[PDB]
Each structure stands twice: as structure tokens, then as C-alpha cells.
A paper describes a structure:
[name] (also known as [name]) is a member of the gelsolin superfamily of Ca2+-dependent actin-binding proteins, which regulate cytoskeletal dynamics by severing, bundling and capping of actin filaments. [name] is composed of six GH domains (A1–A6) and shares 60% overall sequence identity with gelsolin (G1–G6). [name] was first identified in chromaffin cells of bovine adrenal medulla, where it acts as an actin depolymerizing agent that disassembles the cortical network of actin filaments in response to bursts of intracellular calcium, leading to exocytosis of secretary vesicles. Crystallographic studies revealed that these binding events involve the association of eight calcium ions, six of which bind at a conserved site on each domain (type II), whereas the remaining two are also stabilized by contacts with actin (type I; refs 17, 18, 19, 20). Both proteins are able to sequester two monomers of actin, as well as sever and cap actin filaments through distinct Ca2+-induced domain rearrangements of the two halves of the molecule.
Unexpectedly, attempts to crystallize the active form of A1–A3 in the presence of 5 mM calcium led to a structure of Ca2+-bound A3 following protein degradation within the crystallization drop. Attempts to crystallize the active form of A1–A3 (aA1–A3) using a 5-mM CaCl2 supplemented protein sample led to the appearance of a single crystal after ∼80 days, from which a 1.8-Å data set was collected. The conformation of aA3 is highly similar to aG3, with a r.m.s.d. in Cα positions of 0.82 Å over 93 Cα atoms, and differs from inactive iA3 and iG3 by the position of the second β-strand and the straightening of the long α-helix. The structure is stabilized by Ca2+ coordination at the type II binding site, which involves interactions with Glu280 carbonyl, the carboxylates of Glu281 and Glu305, and three water molecules with bond distances ranging between 2.3 and 2.5 Å (inset). As previously noted for gelsolin, this Ca2+-bound conformation is incompatible with the formation of the A1–A3 latch, suggesting that calcium binding at A3 moves A1–A3 away from the inactive conformation through straightening of the A3 long helix resulting in the disruption of the A1:A3 interface. Furthermore, the structure of aA3 obtained by degradation of A1–A3 in the presence of calcium indicates that A3 may exist in a conformational state where it is distant from A1 and A2. The predominance of Int2 at high calcium concentration may explain the slow degradation of A1–A3 and crystallization of A3 in the presence of 5 mM calcium owing to the increased accessibility of the A1A2 and A2A3 linkers to proteolytic cleavage. This crystal structure revealed the presence of a single calcium ion bound at the type II binding site, associated with the straightened long α-helix that is characteristic of the active forms of gelsolin domains G3 and G6, highlighting the similarity of Ca2+-induced conformational changes in both proteins.
Numbering used by the authors:
A (entry chain A), B (entry chain A): 247 to 350
Write the structure that this text describes.
Amino acid sequence: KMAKLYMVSDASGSMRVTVVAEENPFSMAMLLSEECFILDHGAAKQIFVWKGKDANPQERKAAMKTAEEFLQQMNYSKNTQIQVLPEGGETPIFKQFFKDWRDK
Amino acid sequence: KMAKLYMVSDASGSMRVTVVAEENPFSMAMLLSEECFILDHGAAKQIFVWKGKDANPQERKAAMKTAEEFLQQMNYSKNTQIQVLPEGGETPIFKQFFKDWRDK
Ligand SMILES: [Ca+2]
Ligand SMILES: [Ca+2]
């Protein structure tokens, strides 16, 4: 199944959910420390919320809400696994979507 | 460290976050299938969002947002682990807070 990467940010003056990569494998550089991201692999029962260390509280809350909205918007089941990852606390399964993950 | 159990529900006509148990160990019967719950063990770096199989989309979104609000409200670090559990998909660590967990 093919995953999609979204950015959750209010850096534009309003809270926006935008597509940053249509298909995996993704590049690690796509994850910006100042924002939050949603990695949607809902067709394979998995969504990840990634929270940049420099993302603000509004963005962090919006990213959590957005993961839940995806279940309704894309008609994913209630049993969809949602993983919540702070920047630096990423799991091997999350890293697996990236062609060039380099640990800091 | 001592955990606290909260209910996230709009069954009253408005979205409310209420205390259902001040201290662990909790009773499994406290988890109502029609609502969402937050198990706060933030002092030990762990928060759990539990989503009842019969909870509505508004409650599910509010519970996700609430876990993030707890970090700001209780001054927990950005590295606090947040586990998201659908009813029936509970982890051993979540079950460990209950004196009488009985799998269905
Ligand atoms: Ca930002
Ligand atoms: Ca309800």
C-alpha cells in the first residue's frame, strides 16, 4: 500500500494541512522541525503524527485532531493504529517509510 | 507515580473533560464504550487516549486534542509518550493500571 505525507502548520497565518509528498519512500529532509506532519498509511491500518521539536502548541493539537479527521475523511476503520511521535522519538516502522533516515 | 483517569464526552450536550478516578489502580468498568478516556501518567512520561467503540467522531477528535492540551496544562515535556488505543486494542502497559482487566 502507498503512503502519503502531509504537513500541519499555521506558519501562513492560519492552520493548514497540505500535501508535501504524494508517495513513499520519503526523504528525511521533508520533516521540518518547526512543523507537524501526518504520515498516512491508513489503507495498511497505520497513521503517524510526527511533532517537530520547534512546532507550536496550536500545531501540535491540530496534528492530533487531523489524524482523527483522516479516519472520517478517508473512511478508515475505527481500529486504525495512530502512532504519536515527537521529533527524535521515531520508531523503526516510521523510519521504514524514508529512503535516507539518518539518526541525530 | 500516581495516574489519573478522565472521561471525554459530549453526552451532556457539550464537550466535557471530567475526572472519573483520582488514583490508580482503576476498575475496568470505568471505561464506558460510548465515550473516550484519558489516562494521565504524565509524571512518568506516559499519556493514553482510549477511544470507546461507540464514541462519536467529535469525542474521538476532542480526546486526541485533550491529550496534547494536558502537556501544556500540566507542564509535561514535549517528549511525553502519547499512546492511542481503540477499545479492544489495549496494550499490556495500559491494562497494568487496572486491578481487574478482563479481555473480551
Ligand atoms: Ca510551525
Ligand atoms: Ca459518547
